[PDB]
Amino acid sequence: MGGISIWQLLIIAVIVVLLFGTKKLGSIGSDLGASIKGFKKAMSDDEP
């Protein structure tokens, strides 16, 4: 924090994605991204 929010993430995410080779996110994000969707989806409901 202290200046890091979406902008830093954007540059970082872009660099990370090209530099990583778009292999990890696709390999880990598959279980990880999915886990959060299930998590967020589970808590997304029953909330204002």
Side-chain angles (χ1 to χ4, degrees):
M1 283 69 256
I4 310 96
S5 299
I6 271 54
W7 277 107
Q8 285 74 12
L9 280 285
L10 275 156
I11 289 82
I12 288 166
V14 172
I15 295 170
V16 147
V17 181
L18 46 100
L19 93 80
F20 265 69
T22 63
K23 177 186 180 295
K24 271 46 72 68
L25 333 90
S27 293
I28 78 189
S30 182
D31 288 345
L32 210 305
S35 294
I36 274 48
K37 104 184 284 196
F39 194 101
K40 280 174 185 294
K41 181 174 75 169
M43 59 89 94
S44 284
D45 189 21
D46 191 344
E47 282 184 2

